[PDB]
Design a protein around this ligand. Structure first.
Ligand code: CLA
Ligand code: CLA
Ligand code: CLA
Ligand code: CLA
Ligand code: CLA
Ligand code: CLA
Ligand SMILES: CC(C)=CCC/C(C)=C/CC/C(C)=C/CC/C(C)=C/CC/C(C)=C/CC/C(C)=C/CC/C(C)=C/CC/C(C)=C/CC/C(C)=C/CC1=CC(=O)C(C)=C(C)C1=O
Ligand SMILES: CCCCCCCCCCCCCCCCCC(=O)OC[C@H](CO[C@@H]1O[C@H](CO)[C@H](O)[C@H](O)[C@H]1O)OC(=O)CCCCCCCCCCCCCCCCC
Ligand SMILES: CC1=C(/C=C/C(C)=C/C=C/C(C)=C/C=C/C=C(C)/C=C/C=C(C)/C=C/C2=C(C)CCCC2(C)C)C(C)(C)CCC1
Ligand SMILES: CC1=C(/C=C/C(C)=C/C=C/C(C)=C/C=C/C=C(C)/C=C/C=C(C)/C=C/C2=C(C)CCCC2(C)C)C(C)(C)CCC1
Ligand SMILES: CC1=C(/C=C/C(C)=C/C=C/C(C)=C/C=C/C=C(C)/C=C/C=C(C)/C=C/C2=C(C)CCCC2(C)C)C(C)(C)CCC1
Ligand SMILES: [Cl-]
Ligand SMILES: [Fe+3]
Ligand SMILES: [Mn+2]
Lengths: 335, 34, 448, 340, 35, 77, 37, 38, 30, 28
C-alpha cells in the first residue's frame, strides 16, 4: 500500500490515460464544462437582454424565435459596466439574466480554461519526452480571444461593447468596429490578413508538392494512401524531386532544400501575422485608430478632389450615424 | 412566426438518404473477410 | 567559443555567454548605458521643442511629466515657472551613460572572460545556489535604499505635486504618511474588477509614501535574509536551477509588471496627474457631460427631472444603488473621481443645488478644456475617429504609454513561455531532439 | 526538323525555364504588371468617377488604383483601334482602356502559369497536383473580375486594381448584398481559416518532434536532402495529438491531401457564391423574421441591427459611389439612428 | 443565494489547492528522461 | 551566374555610369516639363473645374465619348 | 528651450535619440564583416 | 544555367533589361513629382 | 418545429464525437 | 556656419572603428 496522495498524484499525471488530464487539467475541466453548459442553455432558452440600459431587450434565444444564424448570447448591460456581476450580487436570478448575466459567466471561465489548455499542451509534451513550443504557437489564437473578449471591454469601459457569442452578432460587432475606428487602414490588420492569406496559400502548395512526390507501392484500383504503413522508417517521398519541380518553377534559389527550415517557416508565418492583428485590436481599445486621409488632393481653387479614402469615409459616417441612438448631439466622443 | 413544412421534408431527406447510403457501404465491406 | 564550435548560430550568439561571466558582465553593464542614454537624450530632445506656457500633454512631452510629478520646476496648478530641473536631469543622465559604456567596452574585450578564477566573490555559478541567493540579497538591499529615496523627496526635499490640494494642485510636503498595515494590505484584498480596483485605486499621496516605506523595509529584511540563509528542500524540489530558469522567472515578472503599468497609466490620476498628462478615459466624458449641463442651465431649462426620448433621464440618471449620476452614455462611468468634480458631489451622487451656485472658475474651465481633448487620435497623430476631418491633432500621452507597454508586455509573456520551455527541456535533456535508439512512446502501452 | 529544334531549345534546362507555356505567359504577364505600374503612376480617373488615383495627381500608395471604365460603356472591351477611341491613345487612357487591357492580359498570364505548371510537372516526372490546386485562384479571379460584372450592367461595379478600391468593394458587397449572411461565403471563410490553422499546427508539430542528429542547439544543420531515413517521429506526433485533442493523423499521405483539400474547396465554394450574386440572387432576409418584426415592434435581434446598418452603408455611400445616376437625396431622408 | 456564494467559494478553493500542492509534489522528475 | 562576376568588370561601369544618368534625367524632365500631363491628358491642379462648369465631368455616351471629352477640354476645363 | 549659451548645439541635440537604434544595426555590420561565424 | 553555345545576348539579358530601364525611368519621374508644388 | 431539428443535429454531432474518440479503429505500428 | 558637419561625421563613426581593425588585422 501507499497513501492516497501518491496514488492521486500519479493518477493525475497518468500519460497512459486515453486522454491526458494534467494539473492544469484539473482546473481546466470544470471551467470549460461550466462554459459549455451556460452556452448551450443560454443560446436556447435565455430571456431577452437589456444591453443598452434604456429598456430595449434583444432576443438571442432560439426558443423566442431565432434560427442558428441570428442567435447569440447578448452582452452585459451598459448600466452594469466593468463591475463583477455574479448571481449573488444580483437581487434575483430574474434580473441577473435581464442584465446579460450569462455572458460574463461564459467568458470568464472560457478564457481561464483556454489558458489552462495552453498549460496542458506543455505538460503532455513534457511527459512524452518531446520538444516544447507547440504551446508558443497556441498563444496566437489565445491572445486574439483575450483581446476581443476582455481588453477591448476594459478599454471602451463596459462589457456591452464586447462581441456577442453568435454569428450575426459577430457580424454586428465587425460593422460597428469598422465605423468607429476604421480597422482596414490600420497597417497591423493588413499584416494579419496577409498572414492568413499566405498561411492558407502555403498550406495548399505544401500539400500539393508533397502528395505529388509520393513513391509507388500501390496500384490503380486501391487508393494511394496505403503506401504508408504506420510509423515507417522510410520517408514517404523524395525531397529532391519536389525541389527540382519548384526549382524550375520560380528558380533554383527560391526553392528550399531543407525540410527543417521549410517546416519552421510554415509554422512561423501566420503566428506572427495573428499576433500583429491581435495587438491591433488591443491598441484600438485605447483608441489608437487606423490612418485617416481626408482630402489628400486639393487644387488651386482650393477645392477638394475625392480619393477612394473619401468614399470609405462616407460609408464610415453612414454606419456610425446608425450606431448612435443615444442622441442627435455628439461632438467628441468614445468615450 | 413561420416554419415551412416542405423545408422540414427537405432537411429530413437531405440528412437521411446519404447517411443511409454510407451506413450500408460501411456495413457490407466489414461483413466480409480478411 | 565564437564560431560553430559553441552550439549556437549567429542569430543565437548571445547564448554563447551562458558560461562566460566576464564577457556577460561587459554585455549587461554596456546595455545599462543605453537605457540611461535614452533617458537623458530624449528629455533633452523634448526640451529643445518645449514651449513652457503651453500644457505638457498637447505637445508630446512624456519624460518631463515624470519630473513634474516630483514637484520640480512647477508652480501651483501645474504651470512651469522655471525649466532648469529638466535640463540638469537630462544632461547628467547623458553624461553618466559614458561612464557605464566605458566599463562595458573594457570588460567585454580586455577583461578576464572568466571571473571564477580571477575573483571568488565576483566568481559565480548558476548551479551554486548560495551565490545566487547572496547576489539576490545585495540586489534587494540596493532596491530597498532606492525605495527610501522617494520618501526623502516626500518628507524633506520639497515634497510631491499633490493634485488633490485646495483650488487645483500645488506642491505639498508629506508631514504624516500612514504606517498602518491594515489600510496598506487592504488594497491587495480588493477585487480587480471595475468599481473597486486593486493597488491602482490609490487616491492620495499619504498611502503612496506610506507604502513606499512598507515595501522598502520588507525588502531590506528579505535582502539581509537571503545573505544569511541557504534555500530549503521543498524550495529546491520546486525549481530548476539553471542559468536560463532565472531568466524565465524574471521575464514572467516583467510581463506581469507591464500589464499592471498599462492599467495604471490609463485609469489613475493621482500618480499620473491631470495637469501634466491629459484627462483620463472617463474624465473627458464626465467633463463633456458636466459642461453641457452647465451651459443649458443658464437658459433656465429644467434639467433635474428631465426625461429623455427613451425616458430614464436626459441630463442625470439613477445608478443601480440610486445615486444621481450622469445620463446618456455617461452612465457607464460613475466610478470616476476627479479633484475638480468632487466639491460638487453630495452625500449620494451629485446634488443639483451645488451645481447652481457653487461653481468656482477653475472647475468649469477645467471641464470645458477637457471636453475637446479626449483620448483618441490615429497612428499619424491627428485627432478623432474616422468620420471627422483632419483639422485638430490630439493623441493623449496616456494612449502612447498604454499601447507600447501593452504590446511589450504581451511579447514578454510569450518570451517567458519560450524560456521556461527551453529551461525545462534542457534540464531533462531532450532539447536537441529525441534520441534515435530508445524513445518513450515505443515503451508505452498502445491506446485502443 | 525545325520543330524538334524549337522544342529542345525551349525545353532545355536554364536558370529559369520557359517552354511552350512561356510564349503565352511572359508577354501577357509582363504587359498586365507594366500596365498597372504606369496606371498607378500617371493616369487619372477624373473623367469617369471624379477621383484622383495616381502619383502625378498627388495620391499616396494606399489610395491609387487603375480604375474601372465608365458606366455608359456597358460591357465594351474598349479596344485602342475600336470606334470608341478611333486610333487615339490619350482618350483611350482617359476612358479606362487600361483596366480592360490589364484584366485581359492578366487573364491570359494566369492560363500561361497554369500550363507552365503542367509542363514542368510532365517533364520532371511527378504527378500534377500543384496545377489542379492552382485552379482555385483562377476560379476566384474569373468569378469576381469577369462573371460578376458580366451579370451586372457594366464593368463599373467590378473591383478596381488597388488596395483602397478593394476596400470600397468590401463595403459595397456588405452594404448591398449583405455578403456575410450568405452560406457560401461562410464556407469560404471557414475553408480559408482552416487552411491557416493547419499551416501553423503542421509546422509546429513537425518542428517539435525532430530527431537528435546534430551537435548544436539548432537542428537546421542535421539535415541532408536525402530521404533514406525519416526526419521526424510520426508515431510521437500521433500519440501526442490523440491525447490532447482526441484525434490524430496516422497516415502522412492523407495529412498532406487534407492540407491540399481544405482551402482550395473553400475558394471553390466562394466562387459559386459570387456567381450567385451576379444575377442579384442574394441571401438578405429570412421571411419569418420580417413577418414577426412586422407584428411585434419591440422584437430585436442582431440581424435587424445589421439590416439597419446596411441601410446606413447604402444611403450614405450611394451618392459619390454611383455618380452616373446623378443621385440627389435631401438631408432629411438620409437614415439616422436617433430618428428611430 | 447566500449559501450559493459560500459553496462556490469552497469549490473554487478546493481546486486551486489541489493545483498548488500538485506542482509542489515532485514535478521536475516526472519526465521520462533523467528522473 | 553569381552577381560577384557582374559587379566587377570595367566594361560594366563604362556602359552604365553613362546610360543611367541619361535615363534618370529623361525620367526627371518628363514630368518637370509637364509633358506627362499632355500624353496622359491628366489635369493640372488649376484645370479640374472652370468658371462655367462647376460639376464633375461625366461621360454619358460611348461612341461620342471621344467628342464629349474633347468638348470639356476645348472649353478650357 | 535650451539655455542661450548651448543654443548653438540645437542641431546636435536633435540627432541624439536615434543613436540607440544604430547599435543594433552595427551588430549586423560587424557580423557581415567577419563573414558570419 | 543560361546557354553555353552563347548567343551574344542570352535570355537573362532581356529579363534584367525589361526590368532595368523602366524602373530607372520611373524612380526618376516619381522623384520629380515630389518637387511639384501643390 | 425548427428548434427540434436544430438540436437534434447538434445532438448527433456530439454523439459522433464520443463514438469517434472511444470506438475508433486502432492505429498500430508495423 | 555649418553644424551639419557633425551630422556628417556621426553616421560614419561606427563602421570606421571596424574598418581600421580590418586594416590592422585582428579581433573583428
Ligand atoms: C528581455 C530579456 C531577454 C534576454 C536577456 C534574452 C536572451 C536570450 N534569448 Mg530571448 N526572448 C525574449 C527576451 C529575452 N531573451 C523575448 C521577450 C522573446 C519573445 C520574442 C524571446 C524569444 C527568444 C527566442 C525564440 C530565442 C531566444 C534566444 C535567446 C538567446 C540568444 C538571443 C540572440 O542571440 O539574439 C540575437 C538577436 C537577433 C538576431 C534579433 C535581431 C532583431 C532585429 C533584426 C530587428 C528588431 C526589431 C524590433 C523588435 C522592433 C522595433 C524596432 C525599433 C527600431 C523601432 C539569449 C540567451 C534563442 C535561444 O537560444 O533561446 C533559448 C532562441 O531561439 N529568445
Ligand atoms: C546591446 C546589445 C549587445 C551587446 C551588449 C552585445 C555584446 C556582445 N556580444 Mg552580441 N549580439 C547582439 C547585441 C549585443 N551584443 C545582437 C543584436 C546580435 C545579432 C547580430 C549579436 C550577435 C552576437 C554573436 C554572434 C556573438 C556575440 C558576441 C558578443 C560579445 C562580443 C565580444 C567581442 O569580442 O566583440 C568584438 C567586437 C568588436 C571589436 C567590434 C565592436 C566594438 C565595440 C566593443 C564598441 C562599439 C560601440 C561604441 C562605439 C563604443 C564606445 C566606447 C566609449 C563609451 C568609450 C559581447 C559580450 C560573441 C560571443 O558571444 O562570443 C563569446 C559572438 O560570437 N553577439
Ligand atoms: C555594476 C557592475 C560591475 C561589476 C560587478 C564590476 C565588477 C568588477 N570590476 Mg568593474 N566597472 C563598472 C561596473 C562593474 N564592475 C563600471 C561602471 C566601470 C566604469 C567605472 C567599471 C570599471 C572597472 C575596471 C576598469 C576594472 C574594474 C574591476 C572590477 C573587478 C574588481 C575585483 C576586486 O577585487 O575588486 C575589489 C574592490 C572592491 C570590492 C571595492 C570597489 C570600490 C569601487 C571601485 C566602486 C564603488 C562604487 C560605489 C560608491 C559603491 C557603493 C555601495 C553602497 C551600497 C554603499 C570586479 C570583477 C577591475 C578588474 O580587475 O576587473 C576584472 C578593473 O580592471 N571595474
Ligand atoms: C557587493 C555588492 C554589490 C553591490 C552593492 C552592487 C550594486 C549594483 N549592481 Mg551588482 N553585482 C554584484 C555585487 C554588487 N553589485 C556581484 C557579486 C555580481 C556578479 C558579477 C553583480 C552583478 C551585477 C550585474 C550584472 C548588474 C548589477 C547591477 C547593479 C546596480 C543596480 C542598479 C539599479 O538597481 O538600478 C536602479 C537604480 C537604483 C535602485 C538606484 C541606486 C541608488 C544607489 C544605492 C546607488 C547609486 C550610486 C552608484 C554609484 C551607482 C550609480 C549608477 C549611475 C548609472 C547613475 C548597482 C549599482 C546592474 C546594473 O545596473 O549595472 C549597470 C547589472 O546589470 N550587478
Ligand atoms: C522579489 C524577489 C525575490 C525573489 C526572486 C525571491 C526568491 C525566493 N525566495 Mg524570497 N523574499 C523576498 C524576495 C524575493 N525572494 C522578500 C523581499 C522577502 C521578505 C518579505 C522574501 C521572503 C522569503 C522567505 C520567507 C523565504 C523566501 C524563499 C525564497 C525561495 C522561494 C522558493 C519557492 O518555491 O517559493 C514558492 C512560494 C510559494 C508558492 C508560496 C507563495 C505564497 C504567496 C506569497 C502567494 C500565493 C499565491 C496567491 C494566489 C497570490 C495572491 C496575490 C494577490 C495580491 C492577488 C526563492 C529562492 C524561501 C527560502 O528558501 O529562502 C532561503 C523562504 O523560506 N523568500
Ligand atoms: C501572345 C500575347 C498576346 C495576346 C494573347 C494578346 C491578346 C489580346 N490583346 Mg495584345 N499585345 C501583345 C501581345 C498579346 N496580346 C504585345 C506584345 C503588344 C505590343 C505590340 C500588344 C498590344 C496590344 C494593345 C495595345 C492592345 C491589345 C489588346 C488585346 C486583346 C484584344 C484582341 C486582340 O488584339 O487579340 C490579339 C489577336 C488578334 C486580334 C488576331 C490574331 C489573328 C491570327 C491568329 C490569324 C489571322 C489569320 C488571317 C490573316 C485572317 C484573315 C481574314 C480575311 C480573309 C477576312 C486580346 C486579349 C487590346 C486590349 O487588351 O484591349 C482591351 C489593346 O488595347 N494588345
Ligand atoms: C447550441 C449550439 C452549440 C449551437 C451550435 C452553434 C454553431 C455556430 C454551430 C456551428 C455550425 C456552423 C454554422 C457551421 C458553418 C460552416 C460549415 C458547415 C463548414 C464546413 C464546410 C466547408 C467549409 C467545406 C470546405 C472547406 C473545409 C473542409 C473546411 C474545414 C475547416 C476546419 C475547421 C478544419 C479542421 C482544422 C483542425 C482543427 C484540424 C486538426 C487536425 C489535427 C488533429 C492535427 C494534429 C496533427 C498534426 C500533425 O502534424 C501530425 C503529424 C499529426 C499526426 C496530427 O495529429
Ligand atoms: C440548472 C443548472 C444546474 C446545474 C447542475 C450541476 C452543477 C451544480 C451542482 C451544485 C448544485 C447545488 C448547489 C447548492 C444549492 C444550495 C441551495 C440554495 O441555493 O439555497 C438557497 C435558495 C436561495 O433562493 C433564492 O433566493 C433569492 C432571494 O434571496 C431569490 O428569491 C432567488 O430566485 C432564489 O433562488 O433558497 C432555497 O433553495 C429555499 C430556501 C432554503 C433554506 C435552507 C438552505 C440551507 C440552510 C443552511 C445553510 C445556510 C447558508 C447561508 C448562511 C450562512 C451563515 C450566515
Ligand atoms: C559590446 C558590443 C556592442 C555594443 C556596445 C554598446 C551597447 C555600447 C554602448 C555604450 C554607450 C552607452 C556609449 C555612450 C557614449 C556617450 C558619450 C561619450 C556622451 C558624451 C556626451 C557629452 C560629452 C555631452 C555633451 C553635451 C553637454 C555636456 C551639454 C549640452 C549637450 C552636449 C551634448 C553637447 C555591439 C553590439 C555594438 C557590437 C558587439 C559588441
Ligand atoms: C499599499 C500601496 C502600495 C504598496 C503595496 C504593497 C505592500 C505591495 C505588495 C506586493 C506583493 C505582496 C506582491 C506579491 C506577489 C506575489 C506573487 C507574484 C506570487 C508568488 C508565487 C508564485 C509565483 C508561485 C509559484 C508556484 C505555484 C503557484 C505552484 C507551486 C509551484 C510554483 C513555485 C511554480 C504602493 C507601493 C503601490 C503605494 C500605494 C499603496
Ligand atoms: C501601358 C502600355 C504599354 C505597356 C507599358 C509597360 C510595359 C510599362 C512598364 C513599366 C514598368 C515595368 C515600370 C516599373 C516601375 C518600377 C517601380 C515602380 C519600382 C518600385 C520599387 C520600389 C518602390 C522599391 C522598394 C523597395 C523594395 C522593393 C525592397 C526593399 C527596399 C525598398 C522599400 C526601397 C504598351 C507600351 C505595351 C502599350 C501602351 C500602353
Ligand atoms: Cl449598433
Ligand atoms: Fe509537411
Ligand atoms: Mn462604443
Amino acid at each position: 500500500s501507499a497513501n492516497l496522495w501518491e496514488r492521486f498524484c500519479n493518477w493525475v499525471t497518468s500519460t497512459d490515460n486515453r486522454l491526458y488530464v494534467g494539473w492544469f487539467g484539473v482546473i481546466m475541466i470544470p471551467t470549460l464544462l461550466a462554459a459549455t453548459i451556460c452556452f448551450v442553455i443560454a443560446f436556447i432558452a435565455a430571456p431577452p437582454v437589456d444591453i443598452d440600459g434604456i429598456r430595449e431587450p434583444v432576443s438571442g434565444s432560439l426558443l423566442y424565435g431565432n434560427n442558428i444564424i441570428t442567435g447569440a448570447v447578448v452582452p452585459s448591460s451598459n448600466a452594469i459596466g466593468l463591475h463583477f456581476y455574479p448571481i449573488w450580487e444580483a437581487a434575483s436570478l430574474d434580473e441577473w439574466l435581464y442584465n446579460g448575466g450569462p455572458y460574463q459567466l461564459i467568458i470568464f471561465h472560457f478564457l481561464l480554461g483556454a489558458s489552462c489548455y495552453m498549460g496542458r499542451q506543455w505538460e503532455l509534451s513534457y511527459r512524452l519526452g518531446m520538444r516544447p513550443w507547440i504551446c508558443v504557437a497556441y498563444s496566437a489564437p489565445l491572445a486574439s480571444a483575450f483581446a476581443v473578449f476582455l481588453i477591448y471591454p476594459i478599454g471602451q469601459g463596459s462589457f456591452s461593447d464586447g462581441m456577442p457569442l453568435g454569428i450575426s452578432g459577430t457580424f454586428n460587432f465587425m460593422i460597428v468596429f469598422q465605423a468607429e475606428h476604421n480597422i482596414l487602414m490600420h497597417p497591423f490588420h493588413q499584416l494579419g490578413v496577409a498572414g492568413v492569406f499566405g498561411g492558407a496559400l502555403f498550406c495548399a502548395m505544401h500539400g500539393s508538392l508533397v502528395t505529388s512526390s509520393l513513391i509507388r507501392e500501390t496500384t490503380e484500383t486501391e487508393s494511394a494512401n496505403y503506401g504508408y504503413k504506420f510509423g515507417q522508417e522510410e520517408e514517404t517521398y523524395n525531397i529532391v524531386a519536389a525541389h527540382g519541380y519548384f526549382g524550375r518553377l520560380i528558380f533554383q534559389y527560391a526553392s528550399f532544400n531543407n525540410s527543417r527550415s521549410l517546416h519552421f517557416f510554415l509554422a512561423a508565418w501566420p503566428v506572427v501575422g495573428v499576433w500583429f492583428t491581435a495587438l491591433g485590436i488591443s491598441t484600438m481599445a485605447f483608441n489608437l485608430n487606423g490612418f485617416n486621409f481626408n482630402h489628400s488632393v486639393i487644387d488651386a481653387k482650393g477645392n477638394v478632389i475625392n480619393t477612394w479614402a473619401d468614399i470609405i469615409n462616407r460609408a464610415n459616417l453612414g454606419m456610425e450615424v446608425m450606431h448612435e441612438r443615444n442622441a442627435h448631439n455628439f461632438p467628441l466622443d468614445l468615450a | 412566426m413561420e416554419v415551412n413544412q416542405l423545408g422540414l421534408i427537405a432537411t429530413a431527406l437531405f440528412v437521411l438518404v446519404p447517411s443511409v447510403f454510407l451506413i450500408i457501404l460501411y456495413v457490407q465491406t466489414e461483413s466480409q473477410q480478411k | 567559443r565564437d564560431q560553430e564550435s559553441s552550439g549556437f548560430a549567429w542569430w543565437a550568439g548571445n547564448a554563447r555567454l551562458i558560461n562566460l561571466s566576464g564577457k556577460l558582465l561587459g554585455a549587461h553593464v554596456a546595455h545599462a548605458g543605453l537605457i540611461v542614454f535614452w533617458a537623458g537624450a530624449m528629455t533633452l530632445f523634448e526640451l529643445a521643442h518645449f514651449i513652457p506656457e503651453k500644457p505638457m500633454y498637447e505637445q508630446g512631452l512624456i519624460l518631463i511629466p515624470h519630473i513634474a510629478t516630483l514637484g520640480w520646476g512647477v508652480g501651483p496648478g501645474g504651470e512651469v515657472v522655471d525649466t532648469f530641473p529638466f535640463f540638469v536631469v537630462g544632461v547628467v543622465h547623458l553624461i553618466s551613460s559614458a561612464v557605464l559604456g566605458f566599463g562595458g567596452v573594457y570588460h567585454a574585450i580586455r577583461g578576464p572572460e572568466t571571473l571564477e578564477e580571477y575573483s571568488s566573490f565576483f566568481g559565480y555559478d548558476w548551479k551554486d545556489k548560495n551565490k545566487m541567493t547572496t547576489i539576490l540579497g545585495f540586489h534587494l538591499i540596493v532596491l530597498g535604499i532606492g525605495a527610501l529615496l522617494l520618501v526623502a523627496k516626500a518628507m524633506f526635499f520639497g515634497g510631491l505635486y499633490d493634485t488633490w490640494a485646495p483650488g487645483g494642485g500645488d506642491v505639498r510636503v508629506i508631514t504624516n504618511p500612514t504606517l498602518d498595515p491594515r489600510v496598506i494590505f487592504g488594497y491587495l484584498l480588493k477585487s480587480p474588477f471595475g468599481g473597486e480596483g486593486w493597488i491602482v485605486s490609490v487616491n492620495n499621496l499619504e498611502d503612496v509614501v506610506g507604502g513606499h516605506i512598507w515595501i522598502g523595509l520588507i525588502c531590506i529584511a528579505g535582502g539581509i535574509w537571503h545573505i544569511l540563509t541557504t534555500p530549503f528542500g521543498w524550495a529546491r524540489r520546486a525549481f530548476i536551477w539553471s542559468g536560463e530558469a532565472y531568466l524565465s522567472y524574471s521575464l514572467g515578472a516583467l510581463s506581469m509588471m507591464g500589464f499592471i503599468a498599462t492599467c495604471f497609466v490609463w485609469f489613475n490620476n493621482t500618480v499620473y496627474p491631470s495637469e501634466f498628462y491629459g484627462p483620463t478615459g472617463p474624465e473627458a466624458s464626465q467633463a463633456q457631460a458636466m459642461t453641457f449641463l452647465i451651459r443649458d442651465q443658464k437658459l433656465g431649462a429644467n434639467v433635474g427631472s428631465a426625461q429623455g426620448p427613451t425616458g430614464l433621464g436626459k441630463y442625470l440618471m439613477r445608478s443601480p444603488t440610486g445615486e444621481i449620476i450622469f445620463g446618456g452614455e455617461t452612465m457607464r462611468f460613475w466610478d470616476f473621481r476627479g479633484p475638480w468634480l468632487e466639491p460638487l458631489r453630495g452625500p449620494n451622487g451629485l446634488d443639483l443645488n451645488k451645481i447652481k451656485n457653487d461653481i468656482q472658475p477653475w472647475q468649469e474651465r477645467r471641464a470645458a478644456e477637457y471636453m475637446t481633448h479626449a483620448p483618441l487620435g490615429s497612428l499619424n497623430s491627428v485627432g478623432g475617429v474616422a468620420t471627422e476631418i483632419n483639422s485638430v491633432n490630439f493623441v493623449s500621452p496616456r494612449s502612447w504609454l498604454a499601447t507600447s507597454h501593452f504590446v511589450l508586455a504581451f511579447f514578454f509573456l510569450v518570451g517567458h513561455l519560450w524560456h521556461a520551455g527551453r529551461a525545462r527541456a534542457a534540464a531533462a535533456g531532450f532539447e536537441k531532439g529525441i534520441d534515435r535508439e530508445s524513445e518513450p512512446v515505443l515503451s508505452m502501452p498502445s491506446l485502443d | 526538323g525545325w520543330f524538334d529544334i524549337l522544342d529542345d531549345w525551349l525545353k532545355r534546362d536554364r536558370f529559369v525555364f520557359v517552354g511552350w507555356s512561356g510564349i503565352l505567359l511572359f508577354p501577357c504577364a509582363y504587359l498586365a504588371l507594366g500596365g498597372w505600374l504606369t496606371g498607378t503612376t500617371f493616369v487619372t480617373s477624373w473623367y469617369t468617377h471624379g477621383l484622383a488615383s495616381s502619383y502625378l495627381e498627388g495620391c499616396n500608395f494606399l489610395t491609387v488604383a487603375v480604375s474601372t471604365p465608365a458606366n455608359s460603356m456597358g460591357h465594351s472591351l474598349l479596344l485602342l483601334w475600336g470606334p470608341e477611341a478611333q486610333g487615339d491613345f490619350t482618350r483611350w487612357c482617359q476612358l479606362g482602356g487600361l483596366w480592360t487591357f490589364i484584366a485581359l492580359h492578366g487573364a491570359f498570364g494566369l492560363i500561361g502559369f497554369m500550363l507552365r505548371q503542367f509542363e514542368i510537372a510532365r517533364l520532371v516526372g511527378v504527378r500534377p497536383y500543384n496545377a489542379i490546386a492552382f485552379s482555385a485562384p483562377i476560379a476566384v479571379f474569373v468569378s469576381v473580375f469577369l462573371i460578376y460584372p458580366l451579370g451586372q450592367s457594366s464593368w463599373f461595379f467590378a473591383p478596381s486594381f488597388g488596395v483602397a478600391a478593394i476596400f470600397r468593394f468590401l463595403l459595397f458587397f456588405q452594404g448591398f448584398h449583405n455578403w456575410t449572411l450568405n452560406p457560401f461565403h461562410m464556407m469560404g471563410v471557414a475553408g480559408v481559416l482552416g487552411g491557416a490553422l493547419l499551416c501553423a499546427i503542421h509546422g509546429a508539430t513537425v518542428e517539435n518532434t525532430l530527431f537528435q542528429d546534430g551537435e548544436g542547439a539548432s537542428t537546421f544543420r542535421a539535415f541532408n536532402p536525402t530521404q533514406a531515413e525519416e526526419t521526424y517521429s510520426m508515431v510521437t506526433a500521433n500519440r501526442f495529438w490523440s491525447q490532447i485533442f482526441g484525434i490524430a493523423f496516422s497516415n502522412k499521405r492523407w495529412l498532406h491531401f487534407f492540407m491540399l483539400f481544405v482551402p482550395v474547396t473553400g475558394l471553390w465554394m466562394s466562387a459559386i457564391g459570387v456567381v450567385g450574386l451576379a444575377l442579384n440572387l442574394r441571401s438578405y432576409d429570412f421571411i419569418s423574421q420580417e413577418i414577426r418584426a412586422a407584428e411585434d415592434p419591440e422584437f430585436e435581434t442582431f440581424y435587424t441591427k445589421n439590416l439597419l446598418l446596411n441601410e446606413g452603408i447604402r444611403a450614405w455611400m450611394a451618392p459619390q459611389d454611383q455618380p452616373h445616376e446623378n443621385f440627389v437625396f435631401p438631408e432629411e431622408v438620409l437614415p439616422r439612428g436617433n430618428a428611430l | 443565494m447566500e449559501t450559493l456564494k459560500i459553496t462556490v467559494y469552497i469549490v473554487v478553493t478546493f481546486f486551486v489547492l489541489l493545483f498548488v500542492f500538485g506542482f509542489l509534489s515532485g514535478d521536475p522528475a516526472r519526465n521520462p528522461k533523467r528522473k | 551566374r553569381p552577381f560577384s562576376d557582374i559587379i566587377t568588370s570595367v566594361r560594366y561601369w563604362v556602359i552604365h555610369s553613362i546610360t543611367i544618368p541619361a535615363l534618370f534625367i529623361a525620367g526627371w524632365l518628363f514630368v518637370s516639363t509637364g509633358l506627362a500631363y499632355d500624353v496622359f491628358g491628366t489635369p493640372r491642379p488649376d484645370s479640374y473645374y472652370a468658371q462655367e462648369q462647376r460639376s464633375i465631368p461625366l461621360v454619358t455616351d460611348r461612341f461620342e465619348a471621344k467628342q464629349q471629352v474633347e468638348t470639356f477640354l476645348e472649353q478650357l476645363k | 528651450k535650451l539655455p542661450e549659451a548651448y543654443a548653438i548645439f540645437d542641431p546636435l541635440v536633435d540627432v541624439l535619440p536615434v543613436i540607440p537604434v544604430l547599435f543594433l544595426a552595427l551588430a549586423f555590420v560587424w557580423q557581415a564583416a567577419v563573414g558570419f561565424r | 544555367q543560361e546557354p553555353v553555345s552563347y548567343p551574344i545576348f542570352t535570355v537573362r539579358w532581356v529579363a534584367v533589361h525589361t526590368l532595368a530601364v523602366p524602373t530607372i525611368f520611373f524612380l526618376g519621374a516619381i522623384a520629380a513629382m515630389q518637387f511639384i508644388q501643390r | 418545429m425548427e428548434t427540434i431539428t436544430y438540436v437534434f443535429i447538434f445532438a448527433c454531432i456530439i454523439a459522433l464525437f464520443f463514438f469517434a474518440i472511444f470506438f475508433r479503429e486502432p492505429p498500430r505500428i508495423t | 556656419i555649418a553644424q551639419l558637419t557633425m551630422i556628417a561625421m556621426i553616421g560614419i563613426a561606427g563602421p570606421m572603428i571596424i574598418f581600421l581593425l580590418a586594416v590592422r588585422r585582428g579581433n573583428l
